[PDB]
Design a protein around this ligand. Structure first.
Ligand SMILES: [Mg+2]
Ligand SMILES: [Mg+2]
Ligand SMILES: [Mg+2]
Ligand SMILES: [Mg+2]
Ligand SMILES: [Mg+2]
Ligand SMILES: [Mg+2]
Ligand SMILES: [Mg+2]
Ligand SMILES: [Mg+2]
Ligand SMILES: [Mg+2]
Ligand SMILES: [Mg+2]
Ligand SMILES: [Mg+2]
Ligand SMILES: [Mg+2]
Ligand SMILES: [Mg+2]
Ligand SMILES: [Mg+2]
Ligand SMILES: [Mg+2]
Ligand SMILES: [Mg+2]
Ligand SMILES: [Mg+2]
Ligand SMILES: [Mg+2]
Ligand SMILES: [Mg+2]
Ligand SMILES: [Mg+2]
Ligand SMILES: [Mg+2]
Ligand SMILES: [Mg+2]
Ligand SMILES: [Mg+2]
Ligand SMILES: [Mg+2]
Ligand SMILES: [Mg+2]
Ligand SMILES: [Mg+2]
Ligand SMILES: [Mg+2]
Ligand SMILES: [Mg+2]
Ligand SMILES: [Mg+2]
Ligand SMILES: [Mg+2]
Ligand SMILES: [Mg+2]
Ligand SMILES: [Mg+2]
Ligand SMILES: [Mg+2]
Ligand SMILES: [Mg+2]
Lengths: 206, 262, 152
RNA sequence: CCUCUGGCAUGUUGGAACAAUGUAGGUAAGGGAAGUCGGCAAGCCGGAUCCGUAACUUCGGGAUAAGGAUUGGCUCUAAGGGCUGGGUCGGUCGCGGCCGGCGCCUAGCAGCCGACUUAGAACUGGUGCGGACCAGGGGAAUCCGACUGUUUAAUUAAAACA
RNA sequence: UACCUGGUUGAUCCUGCCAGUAGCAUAUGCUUGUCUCAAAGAUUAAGCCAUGCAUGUCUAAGUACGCACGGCCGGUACAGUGAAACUGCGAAUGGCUCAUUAAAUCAGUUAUGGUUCCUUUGGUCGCCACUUGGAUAACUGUGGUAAUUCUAGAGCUAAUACAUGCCGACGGGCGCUGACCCCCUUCGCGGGGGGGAUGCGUGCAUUUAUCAGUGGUGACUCUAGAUAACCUCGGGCCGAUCGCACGCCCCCCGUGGCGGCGACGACCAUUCGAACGUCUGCCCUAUCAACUUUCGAUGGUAGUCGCCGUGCCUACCAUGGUGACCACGGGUGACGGGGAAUCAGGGUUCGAUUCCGGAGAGGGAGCCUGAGAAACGGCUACCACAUCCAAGGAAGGCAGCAGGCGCGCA
RNA sequence: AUAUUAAAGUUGCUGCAGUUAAAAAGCUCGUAGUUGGAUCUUGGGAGCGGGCGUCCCCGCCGCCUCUCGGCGGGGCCCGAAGCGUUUACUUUGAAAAAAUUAGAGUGUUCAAAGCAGGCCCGAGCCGCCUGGAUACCGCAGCUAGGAAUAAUGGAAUAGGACC
RNA sequence: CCGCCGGGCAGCUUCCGGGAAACCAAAGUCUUUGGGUUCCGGGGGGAGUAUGGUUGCAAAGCUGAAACUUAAAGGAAUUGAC
RNA sequence: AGAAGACGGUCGAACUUGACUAUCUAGAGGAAGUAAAAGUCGUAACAAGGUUUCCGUAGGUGAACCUGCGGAAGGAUCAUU
């Protein structure tokens, strides 16, 4: 059909190999998924030895990790922003491995508000007045306050991330291979990497 | 070769089955099992070729399917089951019990044994494991995944499996001054203490041997398999004692047996 | 800059360049905690692997690539492929009829780790067989000698 | 080919018809030079990009040889350039200078400007797209004259003269 | 047995060949009493094929209400044979041929720390459950078509086929959360020590990310462990399953527990392998000297696919890669090898042909099922051959075994 | 009849020719190719063994290491390591499908074959005894000895070791 | 004029040893066969032809086959005949 | 749950059309070779072959051949004071 195999192409020297047999059902490819963003549409595929490959065709969510902080809520894949291989893939909005998507910051924000007991994403007095006070309001005292004071200069998040949170999406890289596995699991960009991809995206915009 | 092979030509078959030319086109071909095809004595060949218990395959089929034959104390109804090295073959209705230990030629001797002893078997460890929840395993040469062994049984060492229980019952560690039967290549069925082991990284490990009667040789670790702590082994051995006479010495011994003894 | 030349970010995997919130400046003195391995067979992982800041996945020291099987020696003759070289193994092939030999040269393409600076041509090199990491290339450079003739 | 500036009144007249013959333009089913002294006449071909290019040869050519493909609209992507800027720290003198010490982007980075092209991709239309205009029909051969040049103003442009 | 004779000359010695001489195949001629073995459509035409056969299958143990036989027993479904049909497995082996194919096949050698693996063998296998849903085949009966191993509509009726899905299990055990509570100290904020209801998780496999370094190896990004989540969502998985033979025991009477097999699965090892890779090796040919390359040539980076590793393919870069040590191209009366025939020592030639490996089923291509096929005694096209047609349509593949035609010395 | 091997030292590596029999480029330079002078540890020393001494034979003078492991200070010498400067060469070993071949054994009646056979035994033994060997298997790959031959290194605008 | 030494061109001389020989101190150190290395022949004819390729202003040069034919062609030396 | 169907992709048979390449062949006329043969013309060559032959190269000629230049000894001179 659409065969992967060395037999059909030239030798190191340049000369043409001759086809000593016909195509085989293992020296084999398949047509690509090139999965888009959108509500979940996955197809299963039987492969060699039986088994299954779960080819994502559409994909809305993904299980991205905040690295440093070590939380990893499941999140909506909001948009594909950049992809090192090819620019048409970004234009299409096509998730592949090492696509630099954005993801909806919300769950990480929520975890940070719960855990570190501070606000994230700056505002006047709409989020701070009703909900954050209720998350705080220390009827216990002593123990929990000592814990959250032990969560000291330690909260001190990166400046790039904080800006992204206050906007409300996070630059994130896909680590899974959608078209084989079916998931779009990845990690959030941080530090030097983040600095690099933000710089790439700025150069693209001009 | 569109898929797997389901035959074995005669002549293509292993030498050490003693399978003759003129009879038919095929040999049996072992079943898949705990031993490598080219390292077996299929039940049918153990019976009708070597015992002469049966005459045909059909007779062997009949012997087997009364559930008479009992390979490592379990009952096998496959005539092509690969019984192989250091197993048992308990036959019950007669009460002979064999073992499959290599002759000094390297042919699997017909080696009858006592019913005590026919309990246990001896086995090499191919590898040690650590499976889930930290539970360790062995894997024998005859593909027994024993679990929770002694934290000391390491690779190439040999264990005394009980059989009916299963499970290990004391073992011998692979070091110099230990009895060693060879299960491959040129020195097949020779037996002798180790002497020296030369670790080569990458390529595999040559292990020297010295026979009781002063004759030295070597092999590669894989073929070797230990059977006791120096001179005294942990099993019975077939007569000849895995010593390997030179063709001239054998001829002399045959000549002496003839004429004089009778 | 410097290391990040390609369009994607170029990091070593298997180290997490991130966990930091303490005094004494941003990050440590060495800054990035460099992963390397040793390749065994009594081959010295070089200084420029462990010290050096480059990355390369195909480098046998600082990358996913296992040396195994054959180890051959050749001699370097072209260095125009990037992170790779052609090395010319020579040998005397015997014909029996004429109880004589004939020279024969197989010139293998060979991956050259950037831990090795100062590799010239005409350099006796040792290559370990590895998994195939290009159409032609299967062999990573392991150690270099250069001493046959021209200078240290 | 269409337009502005400027210029004209259709070239010594008008009106009404829309016959034949004409002059000048077009189009034609099926065939395709059967027409004729003779493909005369007209028709095919035509622009560009990308391929591809024979015999023969004075080795320069032949050559747009021949023979193929693509071409619109729209929405994007990539690739090609200039200018200016750091002498920051300390001192002192009037944001500016002068001195001394660091720095010294010496892989450069930052901000500000500006023609125009080339390549690639997506979509799209009743397969239409060099949409009008402009714009080579090809080949195989023979005769003559090498060639470019010249020639009978008003019947001979040639193989004649040079 | 390391062997030579005849022939140029009037004669001679040579160079030199031709001719004899002996093997081995293929054929053919004449001939032929007995017996043991024994090759046999390879050479030409991988040219064409009439007829028949060459792959099916049931145990005590997945479904039996054919009524086709019969029981021995009724009525507590079932008892025992049992065609059929669904279910499962097989049909990828074998057999044939050698067209292709010249570092390709293939051989020795090694890798898979770069993957798959039906089966076998061994490990794992904590309110419908006193057992759920409806569908269909055989069987019954209406048929349609000229014609096929065509099938439609209506009746029924099962399952280990196809579906759904629970008790277990310890308001208990361990991670986080923590309404709160208690003890000590302090001028007191504070500091230290303990306990603790209610919530969320309460993992084998999957995918991602982080942490720490039980057992391993020349060799880890291994194996195992800890945290965070995710579910490759009904089309992730085991989670939690159907059949047969004996027939037992309860500090106890109607219940609750019990061994011996079969069959079934997710994961790990094993085996049979398969699949790619490593090193070294092949006949003639220069009247083949340069070849390869934006239609992957050689590298690099990130993907895609694939069982995985790799220009396998895509994007973006780089300009490499092979060659007189014969590349590239052409040829082969070329499948490779084991081996065969000659032979003193060397060699020379042959190897379609019974073992191993490959490749192929008129030619090309595409694919379904499946552990395994790019299958051909499986399908879908086209081409080329051909067969019935009631002319609307339908079927086909002997390089299986016999046999025919044809080709031919064979 | 034809294919083919020996004959054919008439393809020649072993092993042919090239003054006149066929045959040395008209001559020189010249890269790949092929081929390349001599040179470095030796006599000796000490013993076991053979024909006070002489002549032939056999283990010894792999060095260094103790920076490494151990069969509050140590020895003892093995695992590791400066691995044999880096190969070829040679010898040993391991690994090598069988069939064929070579070749043991064995009266298929003989043989070509085949892998079996043979015994005690009146059969009362209710059986027994043995086989189904070895060799070879280019080249390349792997293993450890040897170091003559042949390559190939190291200290020369200086560098080897040293509480 | 008489010697010696090196290296030239040759000469005579012989049972050096070769060689079918004529001859050759090289054409010797060859069945007692291996210092190194180039080129090159393989009965006679067809044929240095045809064909391609290449060089040359040309004349030609280099490279360079086959079918078919043929039992000898050829070398040296001897006796004759001429 | 889901059949026919359709846009687009992909592999891709096949046909049409060139393009190069190999092997096989018909062909007026031309020009070779070899063989038979009881032809024709001469005599080139071997004896000094009656002009030593022979080589390279030009021209010529019914045919062998001849001539010119420079070579050759494979000469009909190892020698000529
Ligand atoms: Mg030889
Ligand atoms: Mg007008
Ligand atoms: Mg007017
Ligand atoms: Mg006018
Ligand atoms: Mg018309
Ligand atoms: Mg007419
Ligand atoms: Mg006409
Ligand atoms: Mg015209
Ligand atoms: Mg033209
Ligand atoms: Mg003319
Ligand atoms: Mg003119
Ligand atoms: Mg005029
Ligand atoms: Mg005119
Ligand atoms: Mg005569
Ligand atoms: Mg002959
Ligand atoms: Mg087969
Ligand atoms: Mg396996
Ligand atoms: Mg052929
Ligand atoms: Mg075969
Ligand atoms: Mg096939
Ligand atoms: Mg056929
Ligand atoms: Mg097929
Ligand atoms: Mg068939
Ligand atoms: Mg011969
Ligand atoms: Mg001979
Ligand atoms: Mg000769
Ligand atoms: Mg001559
Ligand atoms: Mg000369
Ligand atoms: Mg020398
Ligand atoms: Mg000579
Ligand atoms: Mg000689
Ligand atoms: Mg000749
Ligand atoms: Mg006459
Ligand atoms: Mg002559």
């Amino acid at each position: 059909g659409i065969s992967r195999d060395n037999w059909h192409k030239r030798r190191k020297t340049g000369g043409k190999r001759k086809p000593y047999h016909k195509k085989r059902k293992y020296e084999l490819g398949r047509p690509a998924a090139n999965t888009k963003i959108g509500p979940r549409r996955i197809h299963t595929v039987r492969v060699r030895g039986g088994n299954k490959k779960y080819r994502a065709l559409r994909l809305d969510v993904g299980n991205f990790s905040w690295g440093s902080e070590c939380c990893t809520r499941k999140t909506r894949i909001i948009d594909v922003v950049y992809n090192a291989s090819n620019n048409e893939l970004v234009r299409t909005k096509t998730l592949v491995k090492n696509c630099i998507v954005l993801i909806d910051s919300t769950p990480y924000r929520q975890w940070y508000e719960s855990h570190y007991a501070l606000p994230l994403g700056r505002k006047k007095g709409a989020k701070l007045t009703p909900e954050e006070e209720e998350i705080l309001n220390k009827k216990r005292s002593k123990k929990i306050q000592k814990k959250y004071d032990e969560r000291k200069k330690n909260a001190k998040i990166s400046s790039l991330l904080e800006e992204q949170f206050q906007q409300g999406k996070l630059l994130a890289c896909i680590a899974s291979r959608p078209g084989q596995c079916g998931r779009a699991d990845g990690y959030v960009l941080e530090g030097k990497e983040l600095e690099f991809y933000l710089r790439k995206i700025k150069a693209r915009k001009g | 070769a569109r898929g797997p092979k389901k035959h074995l030509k005669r002549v293509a078959a292993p030498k050490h089955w003693m399978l003759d030319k003129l009879t038919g086109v095929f040999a049996p071909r072992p079943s898949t099992g705990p031993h490598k095809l080219r390292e077996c004595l299929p039940l049918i060949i153990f019976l009708r070729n070597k015992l002469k218990y049966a005459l045909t395959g059909d007779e062997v089929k009949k012997i087997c399917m009364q559930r008479f034959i009992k390979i490592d104390g379990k009952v096998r109804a496959d005539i092509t089951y690969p019984a192989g090295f250091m197993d048992v073959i308990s036959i019950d209705k007669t009460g002979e019990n064999f073992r499959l230990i290599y002759d000094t030629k390297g042919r699997f001797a017909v080696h009858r044994i006592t019913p005590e002893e026919a309990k246990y078997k001896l086995c090499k460890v191919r590898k040690i494991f650590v499976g889930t929840k930290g539970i360790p395993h062995l894997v024998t040469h005859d593909a027994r995944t024993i679990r929770y062994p002694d934290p000391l049984i390491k690779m190439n060492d040999t264990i005394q499996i009980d059989l009916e229980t299963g499970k290990i019952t004391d073992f011998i560690k692979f070091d110099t001054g230990n009895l060693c039967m060879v299960t491959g290549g040129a020195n097949l069925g020779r037996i002798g203490v180790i002497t020296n082991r030369e670790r080569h990284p990458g390529s595999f490990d040559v292990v020297h041997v010295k026979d009781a009667n002063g004759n030295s040789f070597a092999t590669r670790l894989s073929n070797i398999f230990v059977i006791g702590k120096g001179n005294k082994p942990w099993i019975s051995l077939p007569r000849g004692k895995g010593i390997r006479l030179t063709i001239a010495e054998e001829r002399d011994k045959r000549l002496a047996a003839k004429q004089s003894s009778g | 800059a410097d290391i990040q030349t390609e369009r994607a970010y170029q990091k070593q995997p298997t180290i997490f360049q991130n966990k930091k919130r303490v005094l004494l400046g941003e990050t440590g003195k060495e800054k990035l905690p460099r992963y390397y391995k040793n390749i065994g067979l009594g081959f010295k992982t070089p200084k420029e692997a462990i010290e050096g800041t480059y990355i390369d996945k195909k480098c046998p020291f600082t990358g996913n690539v296992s040396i195994r099987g054959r180890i051959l020696s050749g001699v370097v003759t072209k260095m125009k492929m990037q992170r790779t070289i052609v090395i010319r193994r020579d040998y005397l092939h015997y014909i029996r009829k004429y109880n004589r030999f004939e020279k024969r040269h197989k010139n293998m393409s060979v991956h050259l780790s950037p831990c090795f600076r100062d590799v010239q041509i005409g350099d006796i090199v040792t290559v370990g067989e590895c998994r195939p990491l290009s159409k032609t290339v299967r062999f990573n450079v392991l150690k270099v000698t250069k001493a046959a003739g021209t200078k240290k």
